[PDB]
Each structure stands twice: as structure tokens, then as C-alpha cells.
Design a protein around this ligand. Sequence first.
Ligand SMILES: O=C(O)CCC(=O)C(=O)O
Ligand SMILES: O=C(O)CCC(=O)C(=O)O
Ligand SMILES: [Co+2]
Ligand SMILES: [Co+2]
Lengths: 361, 361
Amino acid sequence: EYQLTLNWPDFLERHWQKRPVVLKRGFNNFIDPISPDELAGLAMESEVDSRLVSHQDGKWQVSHGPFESYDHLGETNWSLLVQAVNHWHEPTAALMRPFRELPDWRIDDLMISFSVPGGGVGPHLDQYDVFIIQGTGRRRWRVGEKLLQVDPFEAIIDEELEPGDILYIPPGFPHEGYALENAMNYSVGFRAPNTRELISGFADYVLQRELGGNYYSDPDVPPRAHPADVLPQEMDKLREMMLELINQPEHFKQWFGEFISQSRHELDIAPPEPPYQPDEIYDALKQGEVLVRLGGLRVLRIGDDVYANGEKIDSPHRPALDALASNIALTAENFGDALEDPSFLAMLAALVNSGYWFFEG
Amino acid sequence: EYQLTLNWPDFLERHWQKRPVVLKRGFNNFIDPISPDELAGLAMESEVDSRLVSHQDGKWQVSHGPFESYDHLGETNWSLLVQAVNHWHEPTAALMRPFRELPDWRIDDLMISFSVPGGGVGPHLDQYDVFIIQGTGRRRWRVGEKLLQVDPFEAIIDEELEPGDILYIPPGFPHEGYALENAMNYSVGFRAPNTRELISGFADYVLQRELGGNYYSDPDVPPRAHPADVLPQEMDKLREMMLELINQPEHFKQWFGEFISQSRHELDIAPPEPPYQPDEIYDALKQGEVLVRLGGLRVLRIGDDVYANGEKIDSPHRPALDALASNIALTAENFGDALEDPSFLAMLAALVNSGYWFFEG
Ligand SMILES: O=C(O)CCC(=O)C(=O)O
Ligand SMILES: O=C(O)CCC(=O)C(=O)O
Ligand SMILES: [Co+2]
Ligand SMILES: [Co+2]
């Protein structure tokens, strides 16, 4: 397992969502989980979101994958960036574990860039927190003060990253990175909803479930000098209906569990055929087999319920469920007596048959 | 003009959104604004929403317009119902004026039914308030107590309506009406949003305007024993973001003005060609011409702004604008000095060119 040398309370107190910082030797003896060639290969696949970025003579150029080849690209001034490699490559997903000191619901995916000297995407800022882990090679990273693609900035951090160095950047800090030597960078990205996404999502939920069917009612309709007027008390009442629908706590929790447990990038969903019967799940677990969560699959506990990729999961076996949320790899011990409950077993079978968890690989 | 004999404070105190009631002789010497033949003719048009409802030997049958003919229908047991005749026929729109004792924003449209003896749509309840005005002929109306198409009920009102009688029904009271003699009924309908429609609309508004771009921020991210958990304080914060976006008062007002001023039925939008220049509007008004609001067009005042068919209207000429909201027919006096303001004139020209108001007809 990858192991951070970070002082976490320090980082949280001084840097998280406050100030960028180079974590020198964040990882000791850093070994890359994937090679440039493997990355390129991955970028050859259609299910994978990737891009190639180039710059020559002052002018940029972006291409989107999949790429049939790379036959002629150049020695310098380009970079291949692949989103969510952790959805497609397990060793890569291992890089994200140490960052579980921060909450799962806030973590996004892992983006990998390979760059030849000069390669990079130019000066910009992002709306999300990011840890950029330096793998093989070397890159110059610059970060300016809080103000996509921005004007040139005066740097407050200007560093050459070495294998195992990590650059943390809060949202809104302009930054710029380019390779000095053939370089792999691993961006553990975070994600945070905005209010627009929240109200949109919740509205979709309410439409789908046919909730909020209560009509404005006015047996005490107020008088007005002008019949076309809409009075502030009526407005206040309608507004209050809206707020009240939002404050129905159980519905709020269910909607948010479904909303937030969805991923921002395509998952490698491969439903088993033929489907698993509950008995197979039982037997396999009892025989000591490991149930593995699909890479990038979001699984979060909200109250007593667990939410996996948009689906709610409810069971009177609390520790087993919590095991589903916390553990990437699972064994019979994690579930305990819950495996004797056939309703629970059928639930696990449904999850596996959806391709959300798989045995061993 | 049609004139109600109703005691309005009584009706509001005892009946509005509380209890159904037959208003005997609501109108004196009631003259129908439209004939059965004209209604049928209207139902022959494609832009018009209508239906024919029949019952024979225990079994119902519904057909939707437009109808090429009525050649063979029967002497009995059917009814033609046309939605929003006030969108298509001015004398009909005149029936709605007396009901402006209730707020414009709560009023819907006017639906007209013609029925031969036995004709009617059967026992049902509605989610909106309605005044059913009896025109020519006679109908038996029954209304049961608060509980679409319902089981048979024990009536609390069971009356034969005569020309000029009006049956008021609050939402949720089952009712049943059928003709005794060839009968015209005029339903002045009301409408009230539900919470689902409100949050949907507001969400659409926020998406369209790109509002709510503020991201959840957690420099004070709370500790947890389990990394997959989502804590109640974080939930409370997200919820609070939602509520706060809803409570931005000016945005709330604009969104609601745009939302509520839309009609539930197709309008007769006929943009003039060639378009009116502001000067023509000025001249026509100055010469004494009458500017007429399009039938069914919703125009409502919210704060200082006026909203017409989804469009916001802002002008430092308050009385003129208020005139746009309150008056169906307008003359130069209604606008006063505002007509000397070319920005205002251009505004009127835009409204007319959209077909929202027209000169004289
Ligand atoms: O790995 C890279 O070079 C790019 C990382 C980055 O800052 C971004 O794409 O937002
Ligand atoms: O005019 C009619 O017969 C029908 C009125 C009514 O109750 C309805 O359609 O909801
Ligand atoms: Co960036
Ligand atoms: Co009805």
C-alpha cells in the first residue's frame, strides 16, 4: 500500500481549502502504478476519456481520444491526459487510499498525465481541490494567489517536483505545470457540488418520485387594491412551501445519498453472465473469496442507509452495510451473521449482478 | 359587462377554498356570450383543445378534437367540452371579469361545455377551484363532501341549475353534472401551483441563468470515524446552500413573475407584419385607439416589475406599467407622460409585435 508521510492535522488546519503547498517526499520511494506505455494503451480504448495537448510556435492544440496511434507527435511540447484511470486500472486506484483521511464523498477520481519536456496544459485554475503526485521524471509547477485558462501570474510557489512530491492546490489558485524530463503526474481530484447542481438534482428527484404534490391553498386570500398584484405574503407562502419540501429530512437524505453516490466518469460496468444466485455469493464468501468493489464506484453511508452508484441500500444488518461502505475489498468476516440473512444475500447478489462488486477479478 | 350579484366578503369568509355553494341568480338575465354552434365550430379548429364525451350502456367514450364533423352523435348522452374559449372568443373572456375580486394570478381560463340531455363527464374531483356558470338549458349538479374519477358519493348539494346560477366548488369536492335540457356551462377555472411545479420551475430558471454557481466549501471539514460517512453537519450545510439560493429575494421575485405569468393553454399568438414601429404605437394611442390585451394572456405585477407571458417588463413609469397589468383595454390616458419616453414606447412596440397586445382587433 501507498503511505503518506503527511502530518494530517497540520495539513487540515493550515492548507485544506486554504493554501497550496508542496508536500516534499509525500511518498517515500515512489513507484509508479502504471507506465507511460500502458497509459497510452488505455487512451487507445473508446470507453476512456483522454486528450492530447500540444503547443508549437505560440499556438495550442487539443485532440480527444481514443487515439488509433501516436506515430508522429514529437520529442517535446505535448502531454497525454487520461481521466479516471482508477476506473480502469487497479494499481492506480491504490494511490487514492491514503487520501481517505479526507471524506470519500468529497473525493473525485484520479487523472494521469504523461508529458515529454515542455508538455503541459498551460496556466489555468480549477473549481476543485487537487493533489498532484509527481511520479517518474520531473516537472516545474507554479501556483499563483487566489484571483479556466488565465493570464500569466506572479507565482507564490515555483518548484521542481521530484518522484514522491505532491502539490496540493485549493480551488481558485491559478497554476501551471510542464515537464523537464519525461514525466508522469497523478492527480487525485476532489469534487464539491454547487447549489445549482443540488437544486437541479433534488428537483429531478421530486419529479421522478411525484413528491411535492401539495397545492398552494388560500382560504384566507388577502385583499388587494389591484387584482393583477401578487402580494409579499403570498410569495412568502409559496417560498415557504419550497423550503418545507426541502426540509423533509428523510427525503432529503435519500435524495442526497442517490445524488452524491454517482460518479463523474464512466464506470467499467460488466454484469456477470449468467447472473449470480444468492447461494453462489454465500458459498464464495464462505470459502474465503474476496468481494472487490468496482474501481471508482461510489459507496457512501448516510444515516442508516448506504448508497452505491445512485442506488439506495437498506438492511437491518448495520455493521455489514457499513462494511460495504468503508471496505474496498471484503471477506465473510466483514459481514458476520448477515450472510445467514437471505434478504441480505439477495441484496449482495443484486449488487454483484449489476457489476458493482465482483469476485477477485 | 357581466355583473355578479354575489356578496363577496360573505363568499370569501364562508366558501372560498372551504365549501361548495350554489349562487342562485349569480347573474341576472344571463345572456350566453357564445352559441352551441359557434362552440362546435371552434372545436373544429386544430389550435383548440376540445373533447367529446359519450356514455351508452354503462360504457364511456372520449374523443379529442379537432372534429371534422358531428354528423351522427345522438340526441342524448354526450357533451362537447372546449378548454380556454376565452383565448379564442372575446365575448367569452368578458365572463371572467366579475371574478377579478379574486386575484388574477389564481385565475386560470374559461372552459365551455355544451351537453344534450344526459350529457356530462361523470363523477370526479378536481385539484382546482371552479365557478360553473349555467347558461341556456338546465343541468343537475351534485356535490359530495371532501374525501380524478371517483366512486358514487352521497351528495351534500343536489340542484337543478338555471340560467345565471353558479356552482362554486373548492378543490377535492367530488362532483357530477348532467344536462336535463340542451345546456351550456361556463367554467371559470382557477389554478394554484404545487411545490413540485415550483421547485422544478425555479430549478429550470437557475440552470438557464447559470445562477447558484457557488461550491460547497469545507476548510473546516469535520473528522469522522468512517471515511465513507456523510455527517449531519455537512448535510445541513448543503441544505442551507439550497435554502439560501431560494431566499435571494430579487431572483425569487423575477423567477416567480416569469413562471406564474405563463398560461396553461395555447394562446392565439399572431405577430403583426410588418412589425409596428414605436411611432405607430404612439400615433395610434394619441389618436384615441384602444390597445387590447390578447385573450388569456397573463399579466401580473410583482414588486415594481410587470410580467407578461413569461417576459419581465421593467420601467420607471410605474402607473403606466400598473395600467398594463390591471387593464384589459388601454388608451393614452392610462399611460400618461410615459408615452413621451421612447424606451417605454419601444417596450410597448415589442409587446405588440410579439402579438401580446393588438390595436382594436
Ligand atoms: O497533470 C497535468 O499536467 C494537469 C493537471 C491540471 O492542473 C489540470 O488538468 O487541471
Ligand atoms: O361542464 C362540465 O360538464 C364539466 C365541468 C367539470 O366538472 C370538469 O370537467 O372538471
Ligand atoms: Co488544474
Ligand atoms: Co370538475
